[PDB]
Each structure stands twice: as structure tokens, then as C-alpha cells.
Design an enzyme around this catalytic site. Structure first.
Site, PDB file in Angstrom:
ATOM      1  N   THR A 251       1.743  10.608  11.914  1.00  0.00           N
ATOM      2  CA  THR A 251       0.948  10.079  13.018  1.00  0.00           C
ATOM      3  C   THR A 251       1.119   8.617  13.330  1.00  0.00           C
ATOM      4  OG1 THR A 251      -1.072   9.729  11.673  1.00  0.00           O
ATOM      5  CG2 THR A 251      -0.893  11.826  12.824  1.00  0.00           C
TER       6      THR A 251
ATOM      7  N   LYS B 272       3.272   5.083  14.465  1.00  0.00           N
ATOM      8  CA  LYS B 272       4.176   4.847  15.578  1.00  0.00           C
ATOM      9  C   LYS B 272       5.665   5.217  15.316  1.00  0.00           C
ATOM     10  CE  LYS B 272       5.929   0.620  17.911  1.00  0.00           C
ATOM     11  NZ  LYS B 272       5.639  -0.744  18.484  1.00  0.00           N
TER      12      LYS B 272
ATOM     13  N   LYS C 175      -5.956  12.995   7.857  1.00  0.00           N
ATOM     14  CA  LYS C 175      -5.833  13.546   9.215  1.00  0.00           C
ATOM     15  C   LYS C 175      -5.356  14.993   9.321  1.00  0.00           C
ATOM     16  CE  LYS C 175      -5.881   9.298  11.746  1.00  0.00           C
ATOM     17  NZ  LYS C 175      -5.160   8.575  12.846  1.00  0.00           N
TER      18      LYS C 175
ATOM     19  N   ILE D 221      12.780   6.555   4.733  1.00  0.00           N
ATOM     20  CA  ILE D 221      13.310   5.609   5.695  1.00  0.00           C
ATOM     21  C   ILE D 221      12.822   4.167   5.504  1.00  0.00           C
ATOM     22  CG2 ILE D 221      13.428   4.966   8.120  1.00  0.00           C
ATOM     23  CD1 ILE D 221      15.001   7.658   7.428  1.00  0.00           C
ATOM     24  N   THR D 222      11.589   4.059   5.092  1.00  0.00           N
ATOM     25  CA  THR D 222      10.905   2.792   4.953  1.00  0.00           C
ATOM     26  C   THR D 222      11.669   1.652   4.301  1.00  0.00           C
ATOM     27  OG1 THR D 222       8.886   4.120   4.713  1.00  0.00           O
ATOM     28  CG2 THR D 222       8.730   1.602   4.250  1.00  0.00           C
ATOM     29  N   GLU D 223      11.669   0.517   4.975  1.00  0.00           N
ATOM     30  CA  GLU D 223      12.275  -0.685   4.488  1.00  0.00           C
ATOM     31  C   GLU D 223      11.125  -1.580   3.987  1.00  0.00           C
ATOM     32  OE1 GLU D 223      13.655  -3.223   7.677  1.00  0.00           O
ATOM     33  OE2 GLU D 223      15.139  -4.049   6.315  1.00  0.00           O
TER      34      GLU D 223
ATOM     35  N   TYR E 241      27.180   3.696  12.260  1.00  0.00           N
ATOM     36  CA  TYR E 241      27.383   4.193  13.621  1.00  0.00           C
ATOM     37  C   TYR E 241      28.768   3.851  14.127  1.00  0.00           C
ATOM     38  CZ  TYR E 241      22.331   4.166  13.003  1.00  0.00           C
ATOM     39  OH  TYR E 241      21.075   4.301  12.436  1.00  0.00           O
TER      40      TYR E 241
ATOM     41  N   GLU F 249      29.298  -2.652   0.669  1.00  0.00           N
ATOM     42  CA  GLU F 249      29.099  -4.052   0.917  1.00  0.00           C
ATOM     43  C   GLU F 249      28.872  -4.777  -0.416  1.00  0.00           C
ATOM     44  OE1 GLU F 249      25.758  -3.104   3.440  1.00  0.00           O
ATOM     45  OE2 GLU F 249      24.264  -3.998   2.073  1.00  0.00           O
TER      46      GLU F 249
ATOM     47  N   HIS G  52      20.004  -7.052   3.842  1.00  0.00           N
ATOM     48  CA  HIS G  52      19.669  -6.000   2.880  1.00  0.00           C
ATOM     49  C   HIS G  52      19.261  -6.596   1.550  1.00  0.00           C
ATOM     50  CE1 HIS G  52      22.611  -3.051   5.020  1.00  0.00           C
ATOM     51  NE2 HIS G  52      21.439  -3.085   5.624  1.00  0.00           N
TER      52      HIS G  52
END
Lengths: 306, 395
Positions: A24, A26, A50, A103-105, A167, A217, A259
Site C-alpha cells: 500500500t 507509494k 491493513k 528492493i529497498t535501498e 539496462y 564494480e 552504492h
């Protein structure tokens, strides 16, 4: 039982059913909509406090366990804010979700060290991330934040420590028509749930993956460990073409290059040592990030694989 | 990168049971005097508090030589402090005009009969914390590892079980503490490990970690590196971050959560994504140019970030061209193209702009840049972009 056992859950496909933690908020909302239009089987999600609500026409649950039980999800994608992200990953591990993509950074390193401690002592849940773009099997399943349109189902397996640089590799292999079998972003954090060897193993055993692109990297030694795995498993009689690009040749030592894990510290973590190690493992290193597609293309041509 | 003054990191240690020299910080010559009396010490060390190194051989604008002084007389602490506070201290590593000195530390001067190296760091390679120590202290650990690997000891610490007495004792014995000093050191090691955990450090390095002739184990000097990701739970520590010796643009960039790293070149560049940003700096160098900076707008890029980035690059006078490479990110190219031309117009930038945009609605984006009237080159790909950016600036 052993964590390496969960490597296989990395290979998502059209049958993978997904729930979103932080559904829920953003970010969770935005990417769930994109997942839905891509065709990913997003089946619901969670937000503590929720459950009993629907969101994006899907059910919301208070716990990962209930969500899994009710939907049969085999994967979970996490977009929860840093302060609660580790508890979210732990909740997924406790629920034995096969695949968790965080995903969270911004998750504290200390929190990830604790998470990895639990992770390594179980074999049911495979975690990709944190701070990664996710995983995508072109045309079948998209879990994460990458732009779906540049991908094309094909032959190249791609694993990368970065987001948008991946990408580039996807776009270049789509343009020259090779396409991608599976793309996995392992993330830019120092402590995470999946490294290059984990992916390489899946790639070497995948008949659909005929060539691999490995993007790395500066910092850590995951690339050097990947070169050892390749010396052992891709040095003959089996041998798939591997092309690599290592970012940070010009990075100044001692600074975190965006990073959290991209830092040359104590003179360890420099780019050329990784390039040298990969070359010695049979890898073709592309000095230019703009030439990944053409380089792997030439390798296919030389082996008469086109 | 949180930067703490010597007095700040020592306060952090002492508030946490770690043994450090007793000390006070002063804002005035008078305060320095009174603090030297309170210490009640045989010998006092007066140290100017600036972040740069080389204080010892620095020179103040008052004419006083040396940012570090020893004395047995409180009044001399006051007199010397009066010639320090308010003046600029220049050293082998400060800008040419030195740094203003607002504070001095007045500490008891302790002898060091033995120095060892002690560190606790989050080791990626070990999946967790590791205690690193060497009896050969005072020296940068890197060199010791070069010449005498056999003299550097490591203990893997299990984050769930914490540090074991056995481990602290063995490390103390390896660093050569003996008899009662061995138990005192082992105990300082446990205290340091807890401190390391408490403040979300990625590394606490004590060098020298040592003993005084009087049989005391003391953390003489220390360097602490903090996990930036832990800021939301370490607000008091990040608040004391000293940004007064930082590259101004770097401070500015932080106001907006932009990761800016100044380099020496003349080709500025901004990109969405750290990997892509490092690769862009790399490919500009590979095609013969010098990047002016590293700048990560982050993968998801907003128009206001493109705008703040231009505003930032406006302060660096070395910039002769700007390479914009945006690929991915949830905002479509046409919006990005728009903020680019708007930033250009409103900030009055005249340097050539090489732009590489890839994503949704690029055709329209291409149209917006070509119709802008501005000196903007739209690149084919990254290599093309780097080549065009390098061709746009001087030798």
C-alpha cells in the site's frame, strides 16, 4: 537445509505467483501496477494493520504467512522503508517464501548482517537484494523495477551488481537480437542474499542460457569469487561464453560511489584486480560499457553459435 | 561520511566505558585554563580541534607554531590557547589559508609504553564483524599486512552470540598484553565491540591501542566510520557531523540527497544510478577526457533532481561541458527533457550539453531538446556521448 539449495528459486517464470510487502505504500503501488501490466502474476500483498482491504483490486493481508496461505505465492517482493525492511525480510523467511526480492535501498548494514545470519542457516528461502532492481524472465515474469520494454526473450543470462547499468546490457543484447534468458540484479549493498556464483550456477545449468554477461564494480571480492567458480565449472568440458564489464576503473579510493558496497578500502576492491581475475577465468572483459552486446555477439560468432 | 572532531569521537568512547585520556574541550582561553586546572594532571596536552591532519607541525595566523602542545603549567595552557582560538591553523593538509580553530581539547598527557593495533569492522568477506589486531601498532595496518602478515590476527565475531570472553582474551594475548593488563585489554575489546554495535559503525579503529607505564590500557587515538544508512537511528551522532572542512559543492549536494564526488576534470556529468555513473566516468576517461565529478541522481529520477544537479554544477568553475545520461527510472524522457531546457534557461548555463536519454517517450524528448535553441547534442549511446563530450572541451 543448506542455503545453496535455494539457488534454484532464482529462476522465476510464467508460473511464479507474487505478493508485494509494502503493497500500500507509494513505491509498492506504482511497481505493482507495472508488474500487473507486464503480466506478472501479482496476487496480493501485505501491510501490517491493513489486511481485509483490497488494493489495485487485489487482497491486502496483515502477514506474509496469511498471504502465502491464501494465494499460494511462491515469491515476495519487498518495498518497505529501511527502518522496517529487515523485519519484512525476516517475516518472509519465517513464512518460507521460496523467493524474496528486497528492493529497498538504505537498510543498515548491521540489520543485513543479522538477516544474512538467519538466511545462511536455512534452505527454503532464497533472498535477492537488498538495494537491487529485481529479476526478470522476459515475457514471463517481472519482479522489480526495471523497464520492461527493453527486454526480449532470448539467450543471454545477465547478472549485475548495479541497476541502470544492467539496462545498458539488456538494451544492447536486445538490439543485436540475442535477447535475454534471465536477468538478475543482485544489488549494490555489501551484505546481500545472492552473489554472482549463485547466479552463475543457475546460468551454467540452464539450456536456455547460451552466454552470460556479468556486470560488476569496485568493492568486495564477489567478482574474484565468481572467477574461481568459473575456473572450476566453465573451464571445460563445459564452456559457455562469458562477457563482463567492471565499473569504477576511475573511482577515487576511500569514497562510497553511490552504492554502499562500491568502495576501494584498504587498497582492496579495485577494478583492475577484478578484471584480471575474470580474464584468467576465461571471461572476455569488455573495457567499454557500450560494447557488451557486440562483444558477446562476437564470442557467439567465433564459436559458430549464431 | 560522518566526520567527528577528535574530542567528539573520544567523548563517544568515554561515554561508553571505553578508556580514553581524561579531557575537556574549550571555546575560550579562559575555559582552557580552568579546564587544565580541573584535569589535575602531571602533564597536559593542548590540541587544536580541526579535522585535517598535520596539526602537530601546523602554524596559526597568530604566529604560534604547532597545533599540539605539552606543558605542566595550567597557565601556559591558557596563554597558548589564547593564541589558538579564533586563529586559522594551516597544515600540510588544509586549504592554503588554514582552518579557523573554534575549539581546543585540553587533555592529560599519558605515556605510551606499548602500542598495538585494534580494529572492529563489518567484513563483507566474513559475513559480519571481525576483530582485527596486531601487536605491531602505531603503524598503518596496511603496511604491517604487507611486510608481516603473520603479525595480524583476526577473530570472526558471530553477530548473534556477540563477542566471547575467549575471543577477547585470545586477542588481548595476541596483542601481547600480559597478566592483569591482558584482562584489562580483553575487557576494553568487549566494550569497543559493544560501542561498534551501538553506534552503527562499519569500523572502529584504535591505533594506538596501548598501555601506559602506569599499567593502564588506553585507546589513545581512534577513527570511527559510520554506516550512512543508519542515520535515521543515529540522529545525535549525525548531527555532530562537521561539514566545515568539506568541499562546498559536496555539502550543497547533500542538502538535496545528491551523491556528488568532485574529481579533477572539466567534463561534468550526471547520471541516474551509481553503476552507470561510475561507468560514465570510466568511459569518458577511456575516450580521453577527464570527468569533473561523479554524480548519482539515483535510479528513479525526478525533474527537481535534474534541476538541482544543474544548479550544483554551476558552482564548479572547471566545468566546460556536461554529459547527461539518463536511462531507466520511472519518469518519462519528455519530462526530463523539459526540466533540462528549463534548468538551462533559468540558470543561464552556456556550456555545451551532451545528452543521452533512453526510455519512454524519447522521440518527443528528442524533439524537445532539438527545438530548444540551446547548444545541446543528442547522443546515440554511451560511447557516442563520451566521444562527443570529450570533443567539446579543451585539450
Amino acid at each position: 537445509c543448506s542455503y545453496t539449495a535455494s539457488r534454484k528459486h532464482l529462476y522465476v517464470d510464467k508460473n511464479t505467483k507474487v505478493i508485494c510487502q509494502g503493497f500500500t505504500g507509494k513505491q509498492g503501488t506504482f511497481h505493482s501496477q507495472q508488474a500487473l501490466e507486464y503480466g506478472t502474476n501479482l496476487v496480493g500483498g501485505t501491510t501490517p494493520g491493513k489486511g481485509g482491504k483490497t488494493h489495485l483490486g487485489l487482497p491486502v493481508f496483515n502477514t506474509v504467512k496469511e498471504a502465502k496461505e491464501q494465494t499460494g505465492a511462491t515469491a515476495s517482493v519487498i518495498y518497505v522503508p529501511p527502518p522496517f525492511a529487515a523485519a519484512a525480510i525476516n517475516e518472509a523467511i519465517d513464512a518460507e517464501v521460496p523467493l524474496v526480492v528486497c528492493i529497498t535501498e538504505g537498510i543498515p548494514q548491521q540489520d543485513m548482517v543479522r538477516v544474512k545470519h538467519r538466511l545462511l542457516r536455512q534452505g527454503k528461502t532464497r533472498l535477492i537484494g537488498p538495494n537491487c532492481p529485481g529479476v526478470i524472465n522476459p515475457g514471463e515474469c517481472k519482479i522489480g523495477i526495471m523497464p520492461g520494454h527493453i527486454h526480449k526473450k532470448g539467450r543471454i543470462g545477465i547478472v549485475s551488481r548495479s541497476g541502470t547499468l544492467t539496462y545498458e546490457a539488456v538494451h544492447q543484447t536486445t538490439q543485436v537480437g540475442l535477447g535475454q534468458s534471465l536477468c538478475v540484479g543482485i544489488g549494490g549493498d555489501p551484505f546481500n542474499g545472492t552473489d554472482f556464483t549463485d547466479c552463475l550456477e543457475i546460468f551454467l545449468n540452464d539450456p536456455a542460457t547460451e552466454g552470460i554477461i556479468l556486470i560488476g564494480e569496485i568493492g568486495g571480492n564477489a567478482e574474484e569469487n565468481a572467477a574461481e567458480f568459473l575456473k572450476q565449472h566453465n573451464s571445460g568440458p563445459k564452456s559457455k561464453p562469458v562477457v563482463s564489464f567492471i565499473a569504477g576503473l576511475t573511482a577515487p579510493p576511500g569514497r562510497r560511489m553511490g552504492h554502499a558496497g562500491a568502495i576501494i578500502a584498504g587498497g582492496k576492491g579495485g577494478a583492475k584486480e577484478k578484471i584480471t581475475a575474470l580474464q584468467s577465468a576465461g571471461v572476455v572483459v569488455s573495457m567499454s560499457p557500450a560494447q557488451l552486446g557486440t562483444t558477446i555477439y562476437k564470442e557467439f560468432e567465433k564459436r559458430k553459435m549464431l | 561520511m560522518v566526520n567527528l572532531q577528535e574530542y567528539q569521537s573520544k567523548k563517544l568512547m568515554s561515554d561508553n566505558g571505553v578508556k580514553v585520556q581524561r579531557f575537556f574541550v574549550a571555546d575560550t582561553a579562559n575555559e582552557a585554563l580552568e579546564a587544565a586546572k580541573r584535569l589535575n594532571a602531571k602533564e597536559i596536552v593542548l590540541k587544536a580541534q580541526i579535522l585535517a591532519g598535520g596539526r602537530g607541525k601546523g602554524v596559526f595566523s597568530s604566529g604560534l607554531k604547532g597545533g599540539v602542545h605539552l606543558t605542566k603549567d595550567p597557565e601556559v595552557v591558557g596563554q597558548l590557547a589564547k593564541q589558538m582560538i579564533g586563529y586559522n591553523l594551516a597544515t600540510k593538509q588544509t586549504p592554503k589559508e588554514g582552518v579557523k580553530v573554534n575549539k581546543v581539547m585540553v587533555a592529560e598527557a599519558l605515556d605510551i609504553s606499548r602500542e598495538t593495533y585494534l580494529a572492529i569492522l563489518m567484513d563483507r568477506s566474513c559475513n559480519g564483524p571481525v576483530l582485527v589486531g596486531s601487536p605491531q601498532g602505531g603503524v598503518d595496518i596496511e603496511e604491517v599486512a604487507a611486510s608481516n602478515p603473520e603479525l595480524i590476527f583476526k577473530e570472526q565475531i558471530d553477530i548473534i552470540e556477540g563477542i566471547k570472553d575467549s575471543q577477547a582474551q585470545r586477542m588481548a594475548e595476541n596483542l601481547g598484553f600480559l597478566g592483569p593488563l591482558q584482562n584489562q585489554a580483553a575487557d576494553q575489546i568487549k566494550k569497543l565491540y559493544n560501542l561498534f554495535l551501538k553506534i552503527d559503525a562499519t569500523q572502529v579503529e584504535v591505533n594506538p591501542f596501548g598501555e601506559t607505564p602506569e599499567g593502564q590500557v588506553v585507546c589513545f587515538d581512534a577513527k570511527i566510520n559510520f554506516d550512512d544508512n543508519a542515520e535515521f537511528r543515529q540522529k545525535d551522532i549525525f548531527a555532530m557531523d562537521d561539514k566545515s572542512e568539506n568541499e562546498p559543492i559536496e555539502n550543497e549536494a547533500a542538502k538535496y540527497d545528491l551523491k556528488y564526488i568532485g574529481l579533477d576534470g572539466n567534463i561534468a556529468c550526471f547520471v541516474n544510478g551509481a553503476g552507470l555513473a561510475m561507468a560514465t566516468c570510466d568511459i569518458i576517461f577511456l575516450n580521453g577526457g577527464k570527468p569533473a565529478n561523479f554524480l548519482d541522481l539515483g535510479g528513479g529520477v525526478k525533474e527537481s533532481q535534474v534541476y538541482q544537479a544543474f544548479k550544483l554544477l554551476t558552482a564548479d568553475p572547471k566545468v566546460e561541458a556536461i554529459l547527461v545520461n539518463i536511462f531507466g527510472g520511472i519518469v518519462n524522457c519528455a519530462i526530463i527533457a523539459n526540466g533540462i531546457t528549463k534548468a538551462c534557461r533559468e540558470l543561464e548555463l552556456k556550456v555545451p550539453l551532451v545528452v543521452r536519454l533512453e526510455g519512454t517517450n524519447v522521440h518527443e524528448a528528442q524533439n524537445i531538446l532539438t527545438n530548444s535553441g540551446l547548444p545541446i547534442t543528442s547522443a546515440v549511446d554511451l560511447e557516442d556521448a563520451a566521444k562527443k563530450a570529450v570533443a567539446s572541451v579543451t585539450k
